[PDB]
Design an enzyme around this catalytic site. Sequence first.
Site, PDB file in Angstrom:
ATOM      1  N   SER A   1       0.898  -1.119   0.000  1.00 17.43           N
ATOM      2  CA  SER A   1       0.000   0.000   0.000  1.00 17.43           C
ATOM      3  C   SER A   1       0.929   1.158   0.000  1.00 17.43           C
ATOM      4  O   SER A   1       1.922   1.168   0.723  1.00 17.43           O
ATOM      5  N   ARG A   2       0.645   2.149  -0.865  1.00 16.64           N
ATOM      6  CA  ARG A   2       1.525   3.268  -1.061  1.00 16.64           C
ATOM      7  C   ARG A   2       1.114   4.412  -0.186  1.00 16.64           C
ATOM      8  O   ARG A   2       1.778   5.442  -0.173  1.00 16.64           O
ATOM      9  N   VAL A   3       0.038   4.242   0.606  1.00 17.13           N
ATOM     10  CA  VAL A   3      -0.391   5.233   1.555  1.00 17.13           C
ATOM     11  C   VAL A   3      -0.201   4.586   2.887  1.00 17.13           C
ATOM     12  O   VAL A   3       0.262   5.228   3.825  1.00 17.13           O
TER      13      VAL A   3
END
Lengths: 56, 50, 499, 62
Positions: free
Chosen positions: C366-368
């Site tokens: 997940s890039r967040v």
Amino acid sequence: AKSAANKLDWAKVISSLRITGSTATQLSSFKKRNDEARRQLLELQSQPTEVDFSHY
Amino acid sequence: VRYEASLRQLEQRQLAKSVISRVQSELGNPKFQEKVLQQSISEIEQLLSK
Amino acid sequence: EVSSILEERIKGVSDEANLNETGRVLAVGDGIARVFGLNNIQAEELVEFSSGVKGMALNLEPGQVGIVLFGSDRLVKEGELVKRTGNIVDVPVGPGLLGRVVDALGNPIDGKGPIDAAGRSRAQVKAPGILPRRSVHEPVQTGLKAVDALVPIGRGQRELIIGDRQTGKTAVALDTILNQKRWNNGSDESKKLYCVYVAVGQKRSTVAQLVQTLEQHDAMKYSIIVAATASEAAPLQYLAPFTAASIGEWFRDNGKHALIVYDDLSKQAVAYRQLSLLLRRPPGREAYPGDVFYLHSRLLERAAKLSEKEGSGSLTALPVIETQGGDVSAYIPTNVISITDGQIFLEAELFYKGIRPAINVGLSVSRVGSAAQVKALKQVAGSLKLFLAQYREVAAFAQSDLDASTKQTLVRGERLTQLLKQNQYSPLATEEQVPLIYAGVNGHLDGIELSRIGEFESSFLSYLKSNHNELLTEIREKGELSKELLASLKSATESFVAT
Amino acid sequence: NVIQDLYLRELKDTKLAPSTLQDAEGNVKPWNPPQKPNLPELELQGPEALKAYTEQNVETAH
């Protein structure tokens, strides 16, 4: 109550520990445990005893 | 209750074939002619309202 | 009775053709009516045939305007009057769609009557601007233990769910909806996600089961199921996610938050392919039309976490992509992967090996991520990631004379893997996720037998519920773990672990 | 209009007479009301039981 029934039951398991020859400790325990569990799931299972003539 | 819903559906298809019969009745009568006249004058009034 | 309802409707027919533009079919083939007329027509406008078919007008060509029929071929025939509705595709939107299973058009397929819709809004609405967005900081909890910690998900976010074909891909998704019931019940509308499930190509029997499952878990009262079933027409299927997004926009626009799950865009691609090829538009990679990227990106960028100018509102999204034999180099997956801000990658071996969720957290990213993770859960599970990473490396050590350090890791890793199993269609609260993870992190569970892990969880939970529901409540309300709470938590864990 | 007239005429002039309760009865489940969960007989009667339990039990440890 029911907590007594099981408390005395398990008390007898640790009593049978001191007086081995248990062969009907298991028969007493099984029968009360079973039927106690059967009635409670029955009473929670219980359908409303009327025919719903309100909505249906 | 299930059959009650079914009976409503059966009622709907029964009432549908009665429409087919009434359609045959409208197109048979010179209501077929007279309503074309009604449509004609209705279109005249409407089309004038444009 | 039913007749009386009919009389009212029949009385309600008195419309008359008052339109200076009509069309007449020139030739009808392939659901691509090519119409002569319609000189002045707005692009992608909804058009109504004589046979009552509805259409959109994808091709406006110099001599003919090529409507694509939303209906069936048999209905249409040559020369038919083509009335111009004069409204670009728009569908009713409002709060009314909550607890409504609707088809794409907006008509209730659950027959709960006309939608309480406060607008009909167009299906193409451009994505929120740079300045209309703010950085994410609001978690969303799926209740799946691995997902919430290993792959934390925020809100107004893009995050793929790319995995093996119908291996309960839908099951993983449905679980999130169930856990959201707990927060949803909670009065504050910051705790209210109005979920939208977009069932694309899914047969009516399948969607009936879904409907039944949701109804059983009483999720219908914040749930919306936009349904484009297997039988539903390829134009409807094409516009189905676009339409769905618009439903979501109403909630977002009203400043609330909501979660839209597009399942599965892989089938969306095929429907667009069917349209494009039939409209004779040039073919492209993997025989998919060339502007499939533009479509998918356009759809997925209508999900965002809006600035405080825009009243904080958001529309979280979770697209689902179905891996065609695990080919992640495939054109439609590659495109979506680029667009998405994270992916969750479910692996077949894990499913077979009974790990459900079968999410392989190796290739899940997940890039967040941890930006919108519960603070408490963040604290007690940085370690968890690292332990599992080692467990993967020490996986190959499964087959003689082997270092003790690796064996310790292996034990810790296996117990953890068992711990993160969650039986399908049962969610969990974060306030009960953190204690279980704390034990594992502290390696208490390393000692605990693999078979007894399952028993341990519920027992530990029961112990916590009786003994230390103060802790559970403290975790719940504080939302953070403090050294004093962790102190008490450690004590509780020790006491339970001892028994 | 004429449409309304056509409907009006159809509805008015063509009336169904609903199906009997009997035909409905066939198409629905009839109902047979279960009667009595039965009364079992008193179990383990006589001093056969009393004697059996007293005599049989002696199995205790040393």
